[PDB]
Copies of this chain bind each other. A is one copy, B any other.
Amino acid sequence: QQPLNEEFRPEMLQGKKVIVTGASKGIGREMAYHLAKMGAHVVVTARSKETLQKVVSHCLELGAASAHYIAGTMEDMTFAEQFVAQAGKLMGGLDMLILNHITNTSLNLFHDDIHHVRKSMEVNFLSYVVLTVAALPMLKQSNGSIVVVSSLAGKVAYPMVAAYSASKFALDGFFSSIRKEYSVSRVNVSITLCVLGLIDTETAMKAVSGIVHMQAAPKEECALEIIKGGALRQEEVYYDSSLWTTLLIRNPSRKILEFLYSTSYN
């Protein structure tokens, strides 16, 4: 996909119909707040209505054109399928789909917890695919954008996050493949893979305390960069405190192997 070769302006999100999953707290909540100041229409989701309501309250206050919430579990594919239709109904269409939610996880050595491995695949990966299917028709109509929020754990290998790593790796695998398919089918829907480092969210901070020690980037700026990358139709976003990360994490060998062997099949 070709990104919009121009500078980001907040006016790009004005009146834009956006979905934010995992938006009751952390990066999701921060993304909804950014989209509210921009005068966008937001539909937010998580399981907890109480925390979701509070987010909506601040969204309307901040100046969202409209702000709504729908609670449910991304463990349930029916909910996922329905939420998109419901969200679409409320905004009267869809421009951007931000897939951000993840199953609750902890830094632990993997032993025998297949239930968790399965849950991670269903919530962190499978549900993103169901949400993409439900939203693709509306996105085609608006020449919209799919925004996939991933991690450095979905580009390189880390211990204590095997089930998580696997789910995030699958997002790259799937989404990077449909991006190639959208190019050939001439489907004008952009796909942004967001590769994030450690962010100062309540959840991350509690999980990493004592176990891991490294700088945690601000969630406010993290969210803006995810929205920026999405609006500019960038294939990939890299966000982290360190700057070796950013530069080293890109894979030119991968892009050759992809391109210099793309035009080698009819």
Contact = CB atoms under 8 A, between A and B. Distances in A.
A214 B158 CA distance: 28
A47 interface: no
A205 interface: no
A151 B229 CA distance: 29
Contacts of A252: 247-248, 250, 252-253
Interface string A194-209: 0000000000000001
A237 to B, nearest CB: 16
A213 interface: yes
A155 B257 CA distance: 10
A92 interface: no
Q: Point out which of A155, A245, A254, A266 has the most chain B C-beta atoms below 10 A from its C-beta.
A: A254
Contacts of A255: 247
Contacts of A111: 133
A253 B248 contact: yes
A264 interface: yes
| Chain A interface residue bracket vs B | 35 or more
A88 to B, nearest CB: 16
A106 to B, nearest CB: 14
A223 interface: no
Interface in A103-157: 109-112, 114, 117-118, 121, 125-126, 129-130, 133, 136, 152-157
A210 to B, nearest CB: 7
A265 B211 contact: yes
Contacts of A133: 111-112, 114
The 7 closest A-B pairs by CB, nearest first: A169-B173, A157-B176, A159-B180, A166-B174, A165-B173, A166-B173, A162-B177
